[PDB]
Design a protein around this ligand. Structure first.
Ligand SMILES: CCCCCCCCCCCCCCCCCC(=O)OC[C@H](COP(=O)([O-])OCC(O)COP(=O)([O-])OC[C@@H](COC(=O)CCCCCCCCCCCCCCCCC)OC(=O)CCCCCCCCCCCCCCCCC)OC(=O)CCCCCCCCCCCCCCCCC
Ligand SMILES: CCCCCCCCCCCCCCCCCC(=O)OC[C@H](COP(=O)(O)OCCN)OC(=O)CCCCCCCCCCCCCCCCC
Ligand SMILES: CCCCCCCCCCCCCCCCCC(=O)OC[C@H](COP(=O)(O)OCCN)OC(=O)CCCCCCCCCCCCCCCCC
Ligand code: SF4
Ligand code: SF4
Ligand code: SF4
Ligand code: SF4
Ligand code: FES
Ligand code: NA
Ligand SMILES: [Zn+2]
Lengths: 101, 114, 205, 103, 264, 114, 126, 95, 178, 208
């Protein structure tokens, strides 16, 4: 910040940039090191009614894997059609912001 | 349409005659598939996959429009995949995966938690 | 970029150094920039998004030559795209709570812990036993800065993992160093180690 | 100076993290992930947090996910600085390391 | 054989003797009903109501510890009504319970803590003050912190039936009902120390053991008592090379669930 | 008692591999003593090889013998390549270890361990 | 590829890297752990456990910490059946003692017995 | 507070002090045994007893969320004070 | 969406002008001169170096530093030997023993932190129900021996008595975020 | 819509279930089990003979194209007679999908190396050999990768102790680093954490 106008011109010319607008050293633009106290909000389960845990228990909704085929207990068995694991991924579009560097 | 300058992928070169090359590979794949047993699922499904792609190649003479139908990337990636399927079919003929299960596991081999 | 990008010495040390083809990169187990440097259009934040990545706009830099110079350009541009995401995160930061409102998983706030009987019990149990995880296994992957970072985590139903296998992207990349270094000098090998972007905390675990 | 074979010997930083995690609770195991790719710390945490969240069948709240992406991309910059400038330092260009490590 | 009757636990058939309770039928399918007042070696009490479970096609939940099973009943141990009954009961237990877990010896091996984790809600909506009761001195072996008591009456039934000492009872009624001796009196049976185990909460704890250990620390060594010729099976809890306490180890043909105060 | 073999169908075929590995270790000792500058004789190095082989002389299962040879070939490889350092080779000789006495009385005096 | 005939006990002790002292002098206990009498839950009495014989712990002169020379002092292995645990100990060459699982005996509970006309089961208090 | 054993070593608030014949005393030669001098047992006993109008008083230790979990203390017994199990403060009922 | 980082291969014809500009760039090292310009521009920038130890790097109230054991305003210890910190400690760096104090209080007789096991994670101070164990702000406690970093209860209580004024003020600044 | 619970779709479960049937019908010689978890992850469990045919099929078949091996690891389950579960995690960029292939092994039954299918498997198989002691047939260069030179045992086995059997120090008499039996100033403290009350009734095992 304290560079003379001559040195500012020199370093601006040498770099090819306007360095004074984006100094890497921090001055008064940053936050104060003491702040007012926060008051944080509470989540959606902070209710006094209609809030039974059994209606919002994600862990108790997990179940064992579905057995599609088992050589032991579950036989898997017009021409049945072939399938893929998922549909083919669509091609990405070229960026409109800046397609080429 | 004008021939591609690059495929966009390092090591994959542009094909000058993609329609001909795809026809060769797909036709070759259907020949080796006739050597499979009729009931083998690999035969039935691979025949469906290959015939569907062969009919697209017959249908569309434009490379760009053909790439849109095949949905397998650049036509050179489609050719590469076609060669991979043919190589697989030769191996499946010797492996014979259509045969019954070679052995059951121990009863609790796949039981989790223990 | 002013120092390196167009510098003829920098280009002489990185152009056509450690060229990897797209097909080899896939078969060698490469991910991240080691794929995109060879033109493979893949990035898990776009293909398999997690958290709020489907709500931000950014571009995936793609290489054309599969060499160290293209991978350097990809990483420089990825930093520019990160700034683009950060800007959206700053403006779109929503209000509300910062952990799941579910005291059998996330510990309750300290004021609740010191007032309510349930909160104290749940605080006590979460910091001693921990939460039980229903049995199962997942392979979870993200687009880490070095490539696909994965965990294969097995639960046996208890509060301790049964098995945790970590997939480090650099483990496959270093395994490809011998492939990438063929027909190159010792000084090139120094460049190719750098181009893989390797940390041994993750390769060795 | 032509390189005929590269044989990388590793395990010189193998510390048995994966075995140690078996003796930890899920929360106790979290800091081990900071110390894996210890240039991309928060991204390692995020991978493990998502895996646990999946097995728990719970989701983190909206503001947490925006924070996690925000810091994920800060971390990516932290990583790419280290990747680019040390790579340059190994090729002889020492100066970019210093400018960017102040960032 | 002919006396066995068919009931269902969540649709699975079980053959049980006449008089078998709903709680016991669930045991035969490996399902443990939550409980506080029930203890299999004491007389049924049915006062805590943590074992309430829905019977299919019946609109009132039944106390599983006391209700005999009827032929054809389908016990839905995980139905929404069962689950909401457990949450409601747990919420009542925790309303006046003291925020004592850090200073309470039961912490980490507490059935109130654990069944709260597994069957209760995760938060409190109780916005009042809490009850607090004074503590009774019943001797050098058992410490009483009766604000933690949940009025399950297990100690009263142990003292009367197992130990043959009719000195424990309840005084008052309503929210003010207090477990104790009314007068200043010592609880010094040769079996007295077993009330520490069967008290589900930290209301009754071991004076010699107080504050020395947490249960996740201790290594358990299963062993035998030598203070007499009975050969009671015990667990020797140790930590960092030191013996911390002696617990009973169940053996149906010797000491069942109990030990003597010398053994303890 | 029907098992898959690894390499050897019987203990006689496995013994043949053991003798080959023993020959390879025997020839390597003088080169290792010389290249690593170990402060031991060649005779002392070959006696140690012998003692390590006889630590497993009681094994009868051909599969276990197969895996002992596989591991012995690996150890030989990291010795010939000088991937092992002197500290690693000298570890076989336990030169700072006070051996545990084998009689009842000496163990009784020392402590409680059998 | 074909099968071969290996008519001997499976024994992998030479491939495990365990020092000989910690194979031959060790004694494992195969048992179902007893219920903690402080709690009524029975979920921890469902699996078979293998644990090693306890060895000497001593006071660390500096801090007073508990020191040990037993590398197996914390080893606990879980098994779905007694026969799985026995099989695992035998192939590792560990002498073992196996204790039979203890199940609580079935009991007759009658809330009505608390109010008997002429039996000693009548409770004096509720 | 801090006292000294016959060997001259300071005794801690936990009652620790080496024996005269304990070799481990060598560790303090030309160094020092660290002993905190503010014994909590002596300082808590210096606090006055709090007089209250009710038979149940709540203690959270002061400072609200900066203290300890809020607990309720019974003051019916007139022959002794109710002590807080967390912070050790004493309360007595006025009548 | 994707972008090319090095696909500028729209090959075109070359004029004399552009061929000469290319010739000047090669023969007169112009891009190498731009590099020197950049390093020259830094020469005349104020350096980012601070004058340690007279100046310090900025820190925040959340900073995790050297541990301490705190008291209530009366002087009574806050720790009531619950062992939640010991249970959660991911490094098993905490060792605790306790017994009834002479006045019947639940208090520790051992509270050790192996500072060379500890990973300075702050999990202990999250887990403590009474704000007894905290990581303070001090980070300048390097020692000349390993043994000096095996803190016992007396050391940890002296750290609390040494640093409470700053520790209290940092807790007042952050506790509403906890 | 229930803010704390993870949202779920049935589309991926149906797609993965159908592809699971497809794989099982094509490879009945090897496929022992197919399942799709409620996390929507497909696992193909195969006999160990089927490793090379199965993984070749998944790499090269046009409707599969699992060309990227994400990772390859083992799980030790001592209660199983084949205690080692071998897990392959595969990625298909074409269909943006993942699949898991599982087989098993014991201490004396090697698995086939899949380096001819994925060169990526090279170091992973070395890691499995090093950490678990499972041998791989036809591996180009199989040897330890993470452990120290001359290290004895496979530390990721459940019955290998956490701190091992040997420790290192510098000995001034011989002037080198030496290996000695492990002796700990503070023993690792074992915590018994499991609640004796059941957490997940959906996974309750039959009472037998
Ligand atoms: C080739 C060599 C050619 C020599 C060129 C002489 C340059 C004179 C100079 O330094 O002025 C720079 C002067 C300040 O530099 P700046 O980068 O623009 O601003 C930085 C702060 O303002 C700087 O201001 P400040 O905030 O630091 O405070 C005022 C400034 C005042 O100090 C100075 O300006 C340095 C004067 C020396 O600094 C001091 O107070 C420190 C005083 C002690 C000086 C210690 C420097 C080393 C002494 C060198 C003596 C020569 C060796 C003898 C043996 O800029 C000019 O005006 C240069 C114009 C060209 C003049 C020729
Ligand atoms: C009337 C008669 C007229 C006749 C006279 C005509 C003379 C025309 C002027 C020609 C002057 C050229 C000098 C020779 C240097 C040169 O031009 O070589 C360029 C050299 C190679 O450039 P490169 O990009 O690698 O391409 C290779 C094919 N050219 O690249 C280089 O040499 C660059 C090496 C620089 C290495 C960095 C060292 C520091 C440079 C900063 C110096 C600051 C002072
Ligand atoms: C030895 C010197 C060789 C001849 C020097 C002349 C080179 C020159 O003119 O510099 C040009 C450079 C601009 O760079 P550029 O964008 O590539 O120019 C386009 C030209 N068609 O100009 C610049 O980069 C701007 C000046 C920044 C560098 C200032 C320091 C001058 C370095 C030269 C002294 C070397 C010591
Ligand atoms: S009895 Fe249980 S819930 Fe009550 S204070 Fe003690 S540990 Fe906490
Ligand atoms: S003191 Fe314990 S056993 Fe007795 S009634 Fe109260 S909670 Fe039940
Ligand atoms: S900061 Fe972390 S590692 Fe250190 S003592 Fe606290 S919990 Fe343990
Ligand atoms: S410091 Fe806190 S958490 Fe640790 S034992 Fe003391 S009161 Fe409990
Ligand atoms: S256990 Fe049935 S009401 Fe108490
Ligand atoms: Na109790
Ligand atoms: Zn208080």
């Amino acid at each position: 910040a304290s560079a003379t106008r001559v040195i500012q011109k020199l370093r601006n010319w040498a770099s090819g940039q306007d360095l004074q607008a984006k100094l890497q050293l921090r001055y008064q633009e940053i936050a104060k090191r003491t702040q007012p106290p926060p008051k944080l909000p509470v989540g959606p389960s902070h209710k006094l009614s209609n809030n039974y845990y059994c209606t919002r228990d994600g862990r108790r909704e997990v179940v064992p894997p579905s057995i599609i085929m088992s050589s032991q207990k579950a036989l898997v068995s017009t021409e049945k059609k072939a399938v893929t694991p998922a549909p083919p991924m669509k091609r990405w579009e070229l960026s409109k912001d800046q397609p080429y560097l | 349409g004008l021939l591609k300058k690059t495929t966009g992928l390092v090591g994959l070169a542009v094909c000058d005659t993609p329609h001909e090359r795809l026809t060769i590979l797909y036709t070759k794949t259907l020949d080796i598939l006739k050597h499979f047993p009729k009931h083998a699922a690999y035969r039935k499904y691979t025949e469906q996959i290959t015939n569907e792609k062969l009919d697209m190649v017959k249908a569309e003479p434009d490379v760009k429009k053909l790439e849109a139908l095949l949905q397998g990337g650049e036509v050179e990636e489609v050719i590469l995949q076609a060669e991979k399927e043919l190589s697989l079919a030769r191996k499946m003929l010797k492996w014979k995966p259509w045969e019954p299960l070679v052995e059951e596991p121990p009863a609790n081999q796949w039981k989790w938690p223990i | 970029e002013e120092m390196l990008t167009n510098n003829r010495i920098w280009r002489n040390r990185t152009v056509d150094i450690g060229v990897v083809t797209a097909e080899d990169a896939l078969n060698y187990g490469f991910s991240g920039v080691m794929l995109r440097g060879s033109g493979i259009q893949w990035d898990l934040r776009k293909t398999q998004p997690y958290d709020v990545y489907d709500q931000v706009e950014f571009d995936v830099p793609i290489g054309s030559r599969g060499d160290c110079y293209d991978r350097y350009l990809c990483r420089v541009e990825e930093m520019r795209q990160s700034l683009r995401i950060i800007e959206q995160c700053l403006n779109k930061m929503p209000p509300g709570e910062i952990k799941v409102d579910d005291a059998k998983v996330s510990p309750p706030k300290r004021a609740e812990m010191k007032t309510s009987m349930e909160s104290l019990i749940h605080h006590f149990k979460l910091y001693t036993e921990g939460y039980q995880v229903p049995p199962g296994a997942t392979y979870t992957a993200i687009e880490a800065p070095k490539g696909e970072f994965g965990v294969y985590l097995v639960s046996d139903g208890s509060s301790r993992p049964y098995r945790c296998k970590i997939k480090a992207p650099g483990f496959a990349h270093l395994a490809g160093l011998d492939k990438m270094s063929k027909g190159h000098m010792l000084a090139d090998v120094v460049a190719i180690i750098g181009t893989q972007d390797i940390v041994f905390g993750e390769i060795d675990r | 100076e032509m390189v005929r074979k590269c044989d990388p010997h590793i395990g010189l930083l193998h510390r048995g993290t994966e075995k140690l995690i078996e003796y930890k609770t899920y929360l106790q195991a979290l800091p081990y992930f900071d110390r894996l790719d210890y240039v991309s710390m928060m991204c390692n945490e995020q991978a493990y947090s998502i895996a646990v969240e999946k097995l728990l069948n719970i989701q983190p709240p909206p503001r947490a996910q925006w924070i996690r992406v925000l810091f994920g991309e800060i971390t990516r910059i932290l990583n790419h600085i280290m990747a680019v400038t040390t790579h340059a330092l190994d090729i002889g260009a020492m100066t970019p390391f210093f400018w960017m490590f102040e960032e | 054989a002919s006396n066995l009757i068919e009931v269902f636990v969540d649709g699975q058939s079980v053959m049980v003797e006449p008089g078998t309770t709903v709680l016991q039928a669930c045991e035969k399918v490996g399902m443990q009903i939550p409980r506080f007042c029930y203890h299999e070696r004491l007389s049924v009490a049915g006062n805590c109501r943590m074992c309430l479970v829905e019977i299919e096609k019946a609109p009132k939940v039944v106390a599983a510890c006391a209700m005999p099973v009827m032929k054809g009943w389908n016990i839905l141990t995980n139905s929404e009504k069962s689950k909401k009954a457990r949450e409601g009961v747990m919420e009542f237990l925790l309303a006046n319970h003291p925020l004592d877990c850090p200073i309470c010896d039961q912490g980490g091996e507490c059935d109130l803590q654990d069944q709260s984790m597994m069957f209760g809600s995760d938060r409190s909506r109780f916005l009042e003050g809490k009850r607090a009761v004074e503590d009774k001195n019943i001797g050098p072996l058992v410490k009483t912190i009766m604000t933690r008591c949940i009025q399950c009456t297990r100690c009263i039934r142990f003292a009367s039936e197992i130990a043959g000492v009719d000195d424990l009872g309840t005084t008052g009624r309503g929210n003010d009902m207090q477990v104790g001796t009314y007068i200043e009196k010592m609880f010094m049976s040769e079996l007295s120390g077993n009330v520490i185990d069967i008290c589900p909460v930290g209301a009754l704890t071991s004076k010699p053991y107080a504050f020395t250990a947490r249960p996740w620390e201790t290594r358990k060594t299963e062993s035998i008592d030598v203070m007499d010729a009975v050969g009671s099976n015990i667990v020797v809890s140790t930590r960092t090379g030191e013996v911390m306490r002696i617990l009973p180890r169940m053996h149906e043909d010797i000491n069942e669930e109990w030990i003597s105060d010398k053994t303890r | 008692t029907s098992v898959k073999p690894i390499f050897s169908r019987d203990l006689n075929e496995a013994k043949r591999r053991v003798r080959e590995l023993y020959r390879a270790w025997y020839r390597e000792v003088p080169n290792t003593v010389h290249l690593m500058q170990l402060d031991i004789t060649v005779k002392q190095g070959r006696d140690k090889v012998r003692e390590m082989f006889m630590k497993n002389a009681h094994v009868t299962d051909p599969r276990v013998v197969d895996l002992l040879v596989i591991k012995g070939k690996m150890e030989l490889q990291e010795t010939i390549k000088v991937w092992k350092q002197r500290t690693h080779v000298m570890r076989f000789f336990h030169e700072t270890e006070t051996p545990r006495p084998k009689d009842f009385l000496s163990k009784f005096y020392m402590g409680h361990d059998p | 590829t074909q099968l071969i005939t290996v008519d001997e006990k499976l024994d992998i002790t030479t491939l495990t890297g365990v020092p000989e002292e910690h194979i031959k002098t060790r004694k494992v206990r195969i048992f179902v752990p007893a219920r903690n009498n402080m709690q009524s839950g029975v979920n921890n009495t469902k699996k078979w456990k293998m644990e090693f014989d306890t060895r000497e712990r001593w006071e660390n002169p500096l801090m007073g910490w508990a020191s040990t020379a037993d590398p197996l002092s914390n080893m606990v292995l879980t098994f779905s059946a007694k026969e799985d645990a026995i099989a695992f100990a035998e192939k590792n060459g560990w002498s073992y003692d196996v204790e039979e699982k203890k199940v609580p005996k079935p009991k007759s509970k009658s809330y009505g017995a608390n109010f008997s006309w002429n039996k000693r089961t009548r409770v004096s208090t509720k | 507070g801090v006292q000294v054993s016959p060997s001259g070593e300071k005794i801690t608030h936990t009652g620790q002090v080496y024996d005269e014949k304990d070799y481990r005393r060598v560790r303090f030669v030309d160094r020092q045994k660290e002993v905190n001098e503010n014994f909590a047992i002596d300082l808590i006993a210096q606090q006055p007893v709090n007089e209250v109008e009710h038979r149940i008083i709540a203690c959270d230790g002061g400072g609200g969320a900066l203290g300890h979990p809020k607990v309720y203390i019974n003051l019916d017994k007139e022959t002794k004070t109710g002590t807080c199990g967390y912070c050790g403060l004493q309360f007595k009922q006025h009548h | 969406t994707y972008k090319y980082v090095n696909k500028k291969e729209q090959e075109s014809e070359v004029d004399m002008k552009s061929a000469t500009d290319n010739a000047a760039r090669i023969l007169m090292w112009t891009e190498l001169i731009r590099g020197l310009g950049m390093t020259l521009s830094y020469l005349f920038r104020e350096p980012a170096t601070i004058n340690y130890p007279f100046e310090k790097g900025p820190l925040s109230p959340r900073f995790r530093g050297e541990h301490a054991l705190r008291r209530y305003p009366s002087g009574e210890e806050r720790c009531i030997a619950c062992k939640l910190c010991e249970a959660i400690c991911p490094a098993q760096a905490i060792t605790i023993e306790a017994e009834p104090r002479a006045d019947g209080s639940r208090r520790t007789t051992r509270y050790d932190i192996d500072m060379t096991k500890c990973i300075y994670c702050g999990f202990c101070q999250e887990a403590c129900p009474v704000d007894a164990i905290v990581e303070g702000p001090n980070f300048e406690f390097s020692t000349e021996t390993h043994e000096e970093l095996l803190y016992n209860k007396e050391k940890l209580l002296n750290n609390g008595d040494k640093w409470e004024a700053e520790i209290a003020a940092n807790i007042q600044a952050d506790y509403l975020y906890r | 819509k229930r803010p704390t619970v993870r949202p779920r779709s049935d589309v991926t479960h149906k797609q993965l279930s159908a592809f699971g049937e497809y794989v099982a019908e094509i490879l009945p010689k090897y496929v022992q089990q197919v399942q799709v978890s409620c996390l929507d992850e497909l696992e193909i469990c195969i006999h160990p003979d089927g490793v090379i045919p199965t993984l070749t099929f998944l790499r090269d078949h046009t409707n599969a194209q699992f060309k990227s091996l994400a990772d390859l690891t083992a799980v030790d389950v001592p209660t199983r007679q084949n205690r080692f579960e071998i897990v392959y995690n595969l990625l298909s960029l074409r269909f943006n999908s993942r699949i898991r292939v599982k087989t098993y092994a014991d201490e004396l039954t090697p698995i086939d190396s899949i380096v001819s299918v994925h060169i990526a498997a090279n170091w992973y198989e070395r890691e499995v050999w090093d950490m678990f002691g499972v041998f791989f047939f036809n591996h180009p260069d199989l040897r330890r990768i993470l452990t120290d030179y001359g290290f004895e045992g496979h530390p990721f086995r459940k019955d290998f102790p956490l701190t091992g059997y040997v420790e290192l120090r510098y000995d001034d008499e011989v002037k080198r680093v030496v290996a000695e039996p492990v002796e700990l100033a503070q023993e690792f403290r074992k915590f018994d954490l499991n609640s004796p009350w059941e957490a997940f009734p959906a996974y309750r095992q039959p009472p037998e």
